[PDB]
């Protein structure tokens, strides 16, 4: 007979339960729930938060900023920068509120927990015989979000500039960025677009072609999406019947022949660049920003001949100046 | 790599600012330090100079109740170094030492780290994101921080890679599952 | 940037869907991509999947059942019927991408999503109410005052140093 | 705030006209086998 713990350890790893509670899950769930319910509430009634140092609370929220695009969870305040602000510090929960305290607690959680999902995203990859690299395609995800919640902060002074969670805060967070790092002028951010602007382009294909090649199982009596009862080892769609097309669209050799070399390529495109981006931001959190061509192109006498990217400079200098107005008393933003 | 990239980004000692660059924070403090000085000389009183935010134009209290440069530089109050320490006191910056003990050299060192900050451009162009084409330095501390990260990062996804597949060798999933005995086909399907 | 400026595109319902498409579509392109590379079977010999069965012969490389229970237990819900999973992969992007395209026509007549009345009015009379929305909104003026002139040469913009908006100290 | 006194009706409905539509086509469906 096995004692009670040897049971626990089976319940948590049981390939039976509705949703696997893998070990990682033992830190994922408790974490994930903490965050969510916290966020979920302070997204409703979020006392006026004061991100940037200056005491001038900017609290978008519902029970204040009565809107969905507006409100969001506002960051930590420079004041207590990169410093750990544990709810149990604020001499008053009201204090832990003024100083974005709710933010952190949530972030660190959803961060670490997502890391837990990352892991417990493979616990079945093993607890159920099958290739482990599913969880690996989840790297591109996590990492990124990490890059925009932890890296940039450690990089610069305090979390104060860490992707505020809320629709519009995103944009703010973004626009700031583009104005402090020519991040649109990056051969990295390119790679997020590069792939993202690819997966979109490709998801349309495999989804296209595949559906574009289905046997014949109903004749508009009902639908065509029935040409597959779940579990059957057949492949509702025809492979070569499929390639015959794309090979015929763009010359052959250009369309995929082997089906497994196909589906892979679909994690290949996304993940490959979505990582890069994830790195890009994570890179600039240390100030190795996008290309600088301001003025670059010159004249003979020396007059300045404008590079397209020079324009890009104004739409930048513009946001550059206005962002965080009245929050810095000197001429150089080093963060 | 991570516990690495950080050392260069922050550490002042094993990474002397004199051989490498001025640690980011060190840069931000150089700013205020400078204009605090440029200004006190013009006859102003940093001690009482009231900010525009109403916080403190050059100086303000910290959550610890200490004195630290103001504006935004508060983001880097934890930072320390040889050119400021003496111009420091028992409760943070010292209004006395900060008024006259302000020895000549510090103003310039305090300057160099301002001009030369851990910010640049891929194609090496020193200066904020949108500076004309002139200086072109890009801090080493910036270079070592970035570099390593990309590497130490990938590696973490590289450890996933193997530590996850190698878990399939001592298991035999590595190569897929067996077309006849797929372990999920013998499980009480939850629904 | 142009659009972020005088149009504040990022705040449009449509474009916020285009985003929905171009993102998820990519998510799919990969969720399924590697959802495959890690489901299929040992129906080849070596330690590499390239020689693995095909081209159209033996039926199916990935057991849509063994993979199923993987997500139905991790992320809660999974597929069934690759017939739709191949037609929902089409929708997602081709779909959302069309969305934006509409909104964009809206920008033609400058008929865009820029302001939230309920907001400007509550902002007007209260120097103490600030939302990201307003913050973003200030950017625009910046990314516009500085731009436009050297961007729209034909409308001879004459912009004095004072006039030009800009934070304190920067 | 000073919203649109009819943003409601507008919303709420747009989440009922369509929605209820499904609860309709769907419901008749489980009755394809004398059930609720």
């Amino acid at each position: 007979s096995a004692n009670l713990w040897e049971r626990f350890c089976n319940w948590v790893t049981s390939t039976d339960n509705r949703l696997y509670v893998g070990w990682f899950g033992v830190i994922m769930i408790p974490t994930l729930l903490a965050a969510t319910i916290c966020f979920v509430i302070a997204f409703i009634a979020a006392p006026p938060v004061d991100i940037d140092g200056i005491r001038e609370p900017v609290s978008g929220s519902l029970l204040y900023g009565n809107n969905i695009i507006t409100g969001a969870v506002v960051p930590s305040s420079n004041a207590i920068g990169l410093h750990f602000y544990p709810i149990w510090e604020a001499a008053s929960l009201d204090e832990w509120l003024y100083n974005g305290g709710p933010y952190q607690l949530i972030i660190f959680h959803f961060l670490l927990g997502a890391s837990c999902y990352m892991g417990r995203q493979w616990e079945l990859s093993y607890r159920l015989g099958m290739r482990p690299w599913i969880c690996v395609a989840y790297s591109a995800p996590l990492a990124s979000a990490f890059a925009v919640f932890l890296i940039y902060p450690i990089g610069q002074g305090s979390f104060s500039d860490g992707m505020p969670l809320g629709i519009s805060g995103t944009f703010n967070f973004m626009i700031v960025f583009q104005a402090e790092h020519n991040i649109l002028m990056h051969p990295f951010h390119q790679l997020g677009v590069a792939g993202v602007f690819g997966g979109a382009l490709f998801c349309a294909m495999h989804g296209s072609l595949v559906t574009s090649s289905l046997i014949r199982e109903t004749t508009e009596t009902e639908s065509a999406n029935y040409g597959y009862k779940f579990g059957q080892e057949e492949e509702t769609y025809n492979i070569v019947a499929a390639h015959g097309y794309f090979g015929r669209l763009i010359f052959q050799y250009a369309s995929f022949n082997n089906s497994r070399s196909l589906h892979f390529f679909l994690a290949a495109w996304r993940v490959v660049g979505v990582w890069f981006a994830a790195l890009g931001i994570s890179t600039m959190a240390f100030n190795l920003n996008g290309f600088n061509f301001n003025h670059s192109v010159i004249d003979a006498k020396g007059n300045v001949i404008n590079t397209w990217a020079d324009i890009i400079n104004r739409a930048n200098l513009g946001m550059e100046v206005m962002h965080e107005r009245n929050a810095h008393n000197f001429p150089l933003d080093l963060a | 790599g991570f516990i690495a990239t950080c050392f260069v980004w922050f550490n002042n000692t094993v990474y002397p600012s004199e051989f490498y660059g001025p640690t980011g924070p060190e840069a931000s403090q150089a700013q205020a330090m400078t204009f605090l000085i440029r200004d006190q000389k013009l006859g102003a009183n940093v001690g009482s100079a009231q900010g525009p935010t109403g916080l403190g134009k050059y100086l303000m209290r910290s959550p610890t109740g200490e004195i630290i440069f103001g504006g935004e530089t508060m983001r880097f109050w934890d930072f320390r170094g040889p050119w400021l320490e003496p111009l420091r006191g028992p409760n943070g910056l010292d209004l006395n030492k900060i008024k006259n003990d302000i020895q000549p050299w510090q103003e310039r060192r305090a300057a160099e780290y301002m001009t030369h900050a851990p910010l640049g451009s891929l194609n090496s162009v020193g200066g904020v994101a949108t500076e004309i084409n002139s200086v072109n330095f890009v801090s080493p501390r910036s270079w070592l921080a970035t570099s390593h990260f990309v590497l130490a990062f990938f590696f973490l996804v590289g450890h996933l890679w193997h530590a996850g597949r190698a878990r399939a060798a001592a298991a035999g999933f590595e190569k897929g599952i067996d077309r006849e005995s797929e372990p999920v086909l013998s499980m009480p399907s939850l629904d | 940037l142009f659009f972020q400026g005088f149009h504040n595109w990022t705040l449009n319902p449509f474009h916020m869907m285009g985003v929905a498409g171009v993102l998820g579509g990519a998510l799919l392109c990969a969720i399924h991509g590697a959802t495959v590379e890690n489901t299929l079977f040992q129906d080849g010999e070596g330690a590499s999947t390239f020689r693995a069965f095909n081209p159209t012969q033996a039926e199916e490389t990935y057991s849509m059942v063994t993979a199923n229970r993987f997500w139905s237990q991790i992320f809660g819900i999974a597929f069934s019927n690759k017939r739709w999973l191949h037609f929902f992969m089409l929708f997602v992007p081709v779909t959302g991408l069309w969305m934006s395209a509409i909104g964009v026509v809206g920008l033609a007549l400058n008929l865009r999503s820029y302001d939230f009345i309920s907001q400007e009015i509550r902002a007007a009379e209260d120097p103490e109410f600030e939302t990201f929305y307003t913050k973003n909104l200030l950017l625009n003026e910046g990314i516009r005052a500085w731009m436009a002139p050297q961007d729209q040469p034909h409308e001879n913009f004459v912009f004095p140093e004072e006039v030009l908006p800009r934070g304190n100290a920067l | 705030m000073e919203v649109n006194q009819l943003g409601f009706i507008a919303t709420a409905l747009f989440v009922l006209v369509p929605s209820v539509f499904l609860i309709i086509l769907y419901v008749q469906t489980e009755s394809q086998q004398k059930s609720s």
Binding site: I44, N67, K229, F230 | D191 | - | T11, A12
Partner: peptide, 30 residues
């Protein structure tokens, strides 16, 4: 209102979530 209007549409998505991860109609294997 609105503030409520917004919370609801939400407290719903949570419902429609609970309904799909537990009242999912089992995938049959034939």
């Amino acid at each position: 209102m609105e503030t409520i209007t917004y919370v609801f549409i939400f407290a719903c998505i949570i419902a429609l979530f609970f309904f799909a991860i537990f009242f999912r109609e089992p995938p049959r294997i034939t």
